[PDB]
Design a protein around this nucleic acid. Structure first.
Lengths: 350, 334
DNA sequence: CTTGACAAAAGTGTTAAATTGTGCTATACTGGGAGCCGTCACGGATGC
DNA sequence: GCATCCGTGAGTAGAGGGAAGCACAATTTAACACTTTTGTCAAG
């Protein structure tokens, strides 16, 4: 209903309000010391899905190598932007380059550049440039017949990777059991792996490399950003009507007519809430009322067929989508599936 | 822009690259190993296996929260040998999230073949996504079969069950919905062979044993959908179906006035009876509190046997009959 | 006013038959379809 | 200024109109055998 009542209180345009309400862009509620493009992130700042993912989960990219060709880099070797990881593909960011799937494992036995063909249904259990004791498994397989083990001690080298993954992260090798696990978030100075012996120097999400015996911290921030009416509801709850009224009253002293007209319209809505006693957050629904059934009847007619009102179908759609969201949340569905359900629930209420 | 919810969803799922064969195997192996580690952790720690997977899932997802932190700290206090299974559980939960996200294109291709059967396209996709999640848990990568071979069965099943449960205003059981679909399919085949609409007898014979024409007609009556009250009638948009349906529930003014006239005339005739005689009839017929009272409760209230009330109740009835015949004041009400 | 003493009716318990709800299927399959201008003409409010 | 968005346009009547199958487990329904009720026919 133009002009928007929610938008007037929150100083948001119609375009901005629709983007947040229908799950198009994020809005910042707590920056948590995040820097985007060299500029610190402020509150009430609109972020795109690409920008939010970079700040929350870090930056990384994978480059698929052509068959047969071999990369000129090593595992765990740092690269710079534009550096040629492979002759056929170039990188687009700086970070640590790690092998994804070595199509051929060239174990150097010590008694020996023996060549092993690794099928896609097989996985390597030892890292590159590592000492493997005699009798230990080297490449695991579904069928024990095709399983490859270590004939003797030697150095295992990886060759012909399927692709190279470049992730902007910091590697901290650990000696003893790690005090954190995969999925945790750390800050500079926190005890990382060896009970304080190894500590992180940057914010990020920690993932544990058991095979490589290193701890990786992908640079990111624990930023608080939300979409939908949930983020709008919290903003309305934190509003101070008394403080806002004083601020708008001072702006009313501007000699410019345009500013005075703008401040008067906002102050009219603020005063209406103060006098009536209503709360701004009541404009967002938590419980949906249901009309009495006799006002939306389902009655039989002189014959045998039934007749019903359109409101019963609209109520059925809302219940069906609300119940499906409860089941999806309990199963730990990914955010993409959850976000689609929430957007559909908002449209059903409309 | 953003006016099409279907276009918005397609753009979002297109940002996840499709998995290669090598990548698919690794994710499937990680999920299976993680599930086994959860079972191993529960046996050692003695806690519920269902509860442990939630604590691991909560940490991976991020953002009762009070007890989640408490249980997680106990797991991290285990020695190095037991802490290894914690690492496997965490990696398995992250692989399950990535495995589901990379197969969202498969459900859209399947779900587009079920449109026009009572559910919107977005509703079909969401129901198919539930089937995709189920296939991930039950998938076994040791058989060397590709994921799309096994996941297709679960995605199609979820869409079919949702249609049979949510596409009708008056819900019909799944077993009867299948019967209705078979009945319609059989009639169509007979129609193109006979060159005309088949009769109920012809449909019943082709349906199979245990079917007669009576059962065919009864099934067709069940499969009738209700009609809308706001259906426009005529070209001008001022008349609707609900403008022609009377209400038969509330009594009419004529019916309400007849009840009042009967009551005042009945109580006038009761005054000709004795004080005790009138009370017996008013209780044995239920003119107080609305409930009829048997010869026992009436006897309990008045402290007399049930054979005595029977006679006086009948005696008062016969005196009313004589009075009515001489005046004819209570006959028109029947 | 009461006792007796049936006789049908109403009430209860068990159980088999009918109906209803739920899980599963292993070649491989991975971004929708429909629409199409005598597009109604005119103020009023708002954004910029 | 000039672009974009949004709500508004007489009354009463009539009269036609109006796309899988299977197995198995729970769950509800119907039949049927006693058993307490509770109206009654007959005395006294």
């Amino acid at each position: 209903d133009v002009p928007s009542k929610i938008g007037t209180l929150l100083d948001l345009s119609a375009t901005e309000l629709e983007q947040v309400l229908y799950f198009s862009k994020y809005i910042v509620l707590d920056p948590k010391g995040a820097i985007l493009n060299g500029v610190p992130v402020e509150k009430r700042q609109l972020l795109t899905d690409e920008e939010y993912r970079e700040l929350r989960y870090g930056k990384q990219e994978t480059y698929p190598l052509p068959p047969g060709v071999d990369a000129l880099v090593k595992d765990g070797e740092e690269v710079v932007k534009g550096q040629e990881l492979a002759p056929g593909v170039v990188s687009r960011l700086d970070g640590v380059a790690l092998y994804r799937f070595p199509r051929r494992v060239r174990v150097e036995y010590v008694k020996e550049p023996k060549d092993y063909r690794v099928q896609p249904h097989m996985n390597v259990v030892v890292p590159e440039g590592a000492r493997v004791e005699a009798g230990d498994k080297i490449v695991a397989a579904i069928d024990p017949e095709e399983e490859v083990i270590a004939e003797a001690e030697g150095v295992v080298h990886l060759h012909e990777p399927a692709s190279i993954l470049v992730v902007k992260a910091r590697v901290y090798p650990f000696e003893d059991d790690v005090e954190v696990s995969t999925g945790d978030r750390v800050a500079p100075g926190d005890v990382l792996a060896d009970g304080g012996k190894v500590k992180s120097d940057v914010y990020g999400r920690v993932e544990v490399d058991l095979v490589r015996n290193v701890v990786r911290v992908v640079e990111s921030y624990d930023i608080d950003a939300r979409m939908g009416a949930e983020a709008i509801q919290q903003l309305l709850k934190e509003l101070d009507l008394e403080a806002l009224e004083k601020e708008l009253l001072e702006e009313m002293k501007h000699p410019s007519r345009a500013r005075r007209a703008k401040a008067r319209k906002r102050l009219e809505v603020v005063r209406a809430f103060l006098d009536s006693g209503n709360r701004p957050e009541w404009m967002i629904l938590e419980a949906v009322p249901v009309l009495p059934p006799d006002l939306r009847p389902m009655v039989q007619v002189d014959g045998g067929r039934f007749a019903t009102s359109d409101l019963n179908d609209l109520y059925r759609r809302l219940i069906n989508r609300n119940n499906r969201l409860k089941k999806l949340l309990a199963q730990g569905a990914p955010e993409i599936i959850i976000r689609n359900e929430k957007r559909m629930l908002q449209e059903a209420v409309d | 822009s953003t006016s099409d919810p279907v276009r918005q969803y397609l753009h979002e799922i297109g940002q996840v690259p499709l998995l290669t064969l090598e990548e698919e195997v690794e994710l499937a192996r990680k999920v299976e190993e993680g599930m086994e580690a959860i079972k191993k952790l529960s046996e050692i720690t003695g806690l519920d296996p269902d509860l442990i997977r939630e604590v691991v899932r909560a940490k991976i997802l991020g953002s009762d929260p009070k007890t989640v932190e408490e249980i997680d700290q106990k797991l991290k206090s285990l020695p190095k040998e037991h802490k290894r299974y914690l690492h496997i559980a965490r990696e398995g939960e992250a692989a399950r999230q990535h495995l589901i996200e990379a197969n969202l294109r498969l459900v859209v291709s399947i779900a587009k073949k079920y449109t026009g059967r009572g559910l919107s396209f977005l509703d079909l996709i969401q129901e198919g996504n539930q089937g995709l999640i189920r296939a991930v848990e039950k998938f076994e990568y040791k058989r060397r079969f590709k994921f799309s071979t096994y996941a297709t069965w679960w995605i199609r099943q979820a869409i079919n069950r949702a249609i049979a449960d949510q596409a009708r205003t008056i819900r019909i059981p799944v077993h009867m919905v299948e019967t209705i679909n078979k009945l319609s399919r059989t009639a169509r085949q007979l129609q193109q062979e006979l060159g005309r609409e088949p009769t109920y007898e012809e449909i019943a014979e082709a349906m199979g044993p245990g079917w007669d024409a009576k059962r065919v007609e009864e099934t067709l009556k069940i499969a009738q959908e209700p009609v809308s009250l706001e259906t426009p009638i005529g070209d001008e948009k001022d008349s609707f179906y609900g403008d022609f349906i009377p209400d038969e529930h509330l009594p009419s003014p004529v019916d309400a006035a007849t009840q009042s006239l009967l009551s005042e005339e009945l109580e006038k005739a009761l005054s000709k009876l004795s004080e005790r005689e009138a009370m017996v009839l008013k209780l044995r017929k239920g003119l107080i509190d609305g409930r009829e009272h048997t010869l026992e409760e009436v006897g309990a209230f008045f402290g007399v046997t049930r054979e005595r009330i029977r006679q006086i109740e009948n005696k008062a009835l016969r005196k009313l009959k004589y009075h009515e015949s001489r005046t004819r004041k209570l006959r028109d009400f029947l």
